[PDB]
Scaffold this motif. Structure first.
Motif, short mmCIF file in Angstrom:
data_model
loop_
_atom_site.label_atom_id
_atom_site.label_comp_id
_atom_site.label_asym_id
_atom_site.label_seq_id
_atom_site.Cartn_x
_atom_site.Cartn_y
_atom_site.Cartn_z
N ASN A 208 97.48 -42.89 47.81
CA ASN A 208 96.58 -43.06 46.60
C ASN A 208 95.58 -41.88 46.50
OD1 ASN A 208 94.92 -43.67 48.94
ND2 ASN A 208 94.69 -45.47 48.56
N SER B 192 97.03 -47.40 37.01
CA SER B 192 96.58 -47.90 38.60
C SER B 192 96.71 -49.61 38.38
CB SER B 192 95.08 -47.74 38.95
OG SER B 192 95.19 -46.41 39.31
N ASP C 53 100.59 -52.70 46.31
CA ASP C 53 99.69 -52.96 47.54
C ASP C 53 100.03 -54.19 48.05
OD1 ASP C 53 97.68 -53.17 49.28
OD2 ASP C 53 95.94 -52.35 48.07
N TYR D 162 96.71 -56.44 49.00
CA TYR D 162 95.58 -56.67 47.95
C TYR D 162 95.57 -58.13 47.91
CZ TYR D 162 92.88 -55.77 43.94
OH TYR D 162 91.74 -55.56 43.26
N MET E 198 95.18 -49.63 46.82
CA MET E 198 94.34 -49.47 46.00
C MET E 198 93.15 -48.73 46.92
SD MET E 198 94.29 -49.88 42.55
CE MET E 198 94.40 -51.38 41.17
N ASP F 244 89.25 -49.76 42.89
CA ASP F 244 90.29 -50.39 42.08
C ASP F 244 91.29 -49.46 41.33
OD1 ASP F 244 91.31 -52.89 42.84
OD2 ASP F 244 90.81 -53.68 40.73
N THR F 245 91.51 -48.12 41.80
CA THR F 245 92.25 -47.12 41.24
C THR F 245 92.88 -46.53 42.39
OG1 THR F 245 91.04 -45.35 41.54
CG2 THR F 245 90.43 -46.64 39.57
#
Length: 455
Positions: A229, A250, A257, A260, A302, A306-307
């Protein structure tokens, strides 16, 4: 003045913005959804049924001419090609303009590499088969639609663009890791490597790949490998940077992910692929039984904002291209695997012993390494097509299904489950998986067909 180079630069950044950020739905945001499509529809990802790519796993989207993804895929790539065409059409005479257009030419060659591989079977199956229309002039109000060019004609265009890009990016140096989305000499050699490989120019393939990885190293620890990432990563030759202000792409990490909390986490790993990893391999600890009984592979994550930056080309891929190409070119097997062995050592695995092995066997092993190493990066169905293989899925054994595994849950808590693997084990028509099936190709969409009297 040099404002003209600014214009070409504007159109490239525009083409780049479109390719990654443009989305028709939440399952169809940019090129990353196509990378998600291409792995899920292949052999190594097990669908945890969820919005997005459960359809991909069941061969129920991109081969359907009126499907939503089918239309998205076509227009996103041709939209990108048209912005590139406009940049390449700008008249002028400066270093910066030629660099900007070099980047435009590299991106156009990448788009046509996507197209030729997704809409017709492989070059080495039939090189003169119809493929897709080639547009190199910018689209205006007087532009008519075009009929299909051949697979060989698209690769020609690819090679023409990649050769002019090399020439134009000779003096171009990237100003930092945030500029690693801009094609440079390394990227042109990478794309040439892919192209040579696809057209069976094995010697050239190996040469380009080795040159493409100049300066790049290989990650060597589990801690480095987990996350995928960050564009500053040392293996990344090419990627797209994602930021708070520009991070639509993203959203695709809600699928990828595994750990997540409260997202989709629908890309689970085939346990049979995990069974091919040698103990001590730095990637092995990333596997984790979780949730309902699926084997997660914690490769993608991530970041806290949150990117996640989007990988497009790594040095590991360049090593694998060289290994395959060298074996296929007839290079003595002990020399051919030197690049393979460089990758294995980096990953904590001893050398591959080629004693007794045929070329076929060593190529088979390189292709298994590709599936291990590039899992989830979007190479699945193009490798299936390229090598004229079938998709390969097998359910866990019933003895294995009767087993119980300790499974991670969204709290960090653990609970026992029965292990889950592949469940969609043949085509929707009831037929067994097979090579060069039309289920593997994206369809030219209805909207194009209806509007273009040449198709």
């Amino acid at each position: 003045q040099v404002a003209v180079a600014g214009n070409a630069e504007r159109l490239f950044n525009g083409a780049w913005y479109n390719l990654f950020e443009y989305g028709t739905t939440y399952a169809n945001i940019g090129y990353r959804a196509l990378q998600c499509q291409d792995d899920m529809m292949a052999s190594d990802v097990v669908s945890r049924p969820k919005y997005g790519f459960n359809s991909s796993y069941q061969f129920n989207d991109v081969a359907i001419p009126s499907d939503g993804r089918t239309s998205f895929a076509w227009y996103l790539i041709y939209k990108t090609i048209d912005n590139c065409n406009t940049a390449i059409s700008i008249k002028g005479d400066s270093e910066e303009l030629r660099q900007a257009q070099g980047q435009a030419l590299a991106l156009r060659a990448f788009c046509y590499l996507h197209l030729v591989q997704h809409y017709q079977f492989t070059y080495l199956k039939d090189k003169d088969a119809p493929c897709v229309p080639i547009y190199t002039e910018p689209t205006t109000s007087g532009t008519k639609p075009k009929g299909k060019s051949t697979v060989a004609q698209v690769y020609q265009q690819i090679f023409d663009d990649l050769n002019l890009a090399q020439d134009y990016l000779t003096n171009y140096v990237r100003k930092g890791d945030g500029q690693k989305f801009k094609p440079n000499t390394d990227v042109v050699n990478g794309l040439m490597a892919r192209a040579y490989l696809l057209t069976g120019q094995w010697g050239e393939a190996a040469k380009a790949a080795e040159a493409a990885r100049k300066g790049y190293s290989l990650m060597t620890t589990t801690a480095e490998y987990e996350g995928f990432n960050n564009i500053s990563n040392k293996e990344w030759i090419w990627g797209s940077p994602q930021t708070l202000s520009q991070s639509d792409a993203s959203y695709n990490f809600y699928y990828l992910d595994a750990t997540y909390v409260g997202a989709y986490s629908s890309f689970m790993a085939d346990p049979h692929l995990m069974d091919t990893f040698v103990k001590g391999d730095i990637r092995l600890p990333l596997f984790q039984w979780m949730r309902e009984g699926y084997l997660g592979y914690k490769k993608f994550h991530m970041r806290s904002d949150d990117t996640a930056d989007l990988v497009l080309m790594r040095s590991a891929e360049m090593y694998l291209i060289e290994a395959e190409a060298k074996v296929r070119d007839g290079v003595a097997l002990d020399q051919a695997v030197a690049p393979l062995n460089t990758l294995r050592t980096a990953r904590g695995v001893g050398n591959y012993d080629v004693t007794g092995k045929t070329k076929e066997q060593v190529i088979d092993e390189i292709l298994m390494e590709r599936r291990r190493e590039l899992w989830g990066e979007g190479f699945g169905i193009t490798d299936v097509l390229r090598n004229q293989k079938a998709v390969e899925r097998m359910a866990l054994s019933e003895d294995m299904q009767k087993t119980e595994v300790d499974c991670w849950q969204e709290g960090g808590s653990f609970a026992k489950r029965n292990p889950l693997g592949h469940w969609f084990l043949n085509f929707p028509d009831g037929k067994a998986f097979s090579a060069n099936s039309s289920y593997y190709l994206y369809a030219i969409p209805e909207k194009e067909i209806n509007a273009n009297p040449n198709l």
